[PDB]
Assembly symmetry: C3
Homo-oligomer: 116 residues x 3
């Protein structure tokens, strides 16, 4: 690639004296900046800002964590956080509550939330 | 100075431009990339931008390290259309591991400020 | 450290002209690619693909957010996302529900999930 670093353990270190470290940017709103984790150069997970249309009011460009199968093919977004609302979706592409889960929910201490 | 890779006009200490796989860091043991800071009050950050405007960041904050693993908590921040912070969508407390959603100071293993939706029912299953 | 960058501000910017960005890769299935956050070069947090073995059917290599103590020693996995199922664990390295929490749960608005 443009930059290819090889090492053992600590491959690269980016040191900030303020707020910074690694910026991942794209040249257009339709291109998704991504941090991609691979093993033996096969996709396993990524965290990226997706291409959901930026329609105003801070909508679009939501944060997604994608999982990939053993061959590197997408299995979908396990987490989607919407930028306009902050709503946190688990197995839910369109979260509609501050936490929104599609499927089952397990809690080791009881069946209810504590009113905080 | 500044080092550009693919740009003759770099704007940070290192500035790399590519198409698709811009940079690949390969480790021959468990490991990878480190984001570090020169002092405890400086915040190592992973920042995502589009067209060089902030959108999201995952960073270690400057909550003070007062002992017993206090301070330096993780936060996932969202940013508005102009690139200004909208706040921490997620805050994870380092000392306790408590996971806050829209909650700056989580006090439960999961702590949500706002609403909660579950497709299958209104109760958690006791695990 | 093969590459060591220090800056005021952003430190390092990686710009993609298509969907893509930064790849953290390993040379073997048992070498875990990691993004490690340090202060003064002491571990504080990481996001990494974990050591669960890839035994087939997308098992193993789950995504973890780890928290470290003030000396840099591992304190725990705050979050683990299962690759084969997408299940989201909080304080649970082997989640068995779409959201699985070990410990307590607090909700500011009430005791129940809304049925979505």
């Amino acid at each position: 690639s443009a930059l290819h670093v090889i090492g053992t353990g600590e491959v690269a270190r980016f040191v900030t004296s303020a707020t910074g470290g690694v910026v991942i940017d794209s040249t257009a709103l339709n291109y998704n900046p991504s941090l991609i984790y691979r093993k033996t150069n096969i996709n396993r997970w990524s965290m990226m800002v997706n291409a959901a249309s930026e329609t105003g009011g801070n909508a679009g460009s939501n944060l997604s964590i994608l999982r990939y199968d053993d061959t590197g093919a997408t299995l979908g977004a396990a987490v989607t956080i919407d930028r306009a609302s902050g709503f946190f979706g688990i197995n839910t592409a369109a979260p509609a509550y501050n936490i929104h889960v599609t499927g089952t929910a397990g809690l080791s201490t009881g069946s209810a939330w504590t009113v905080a």
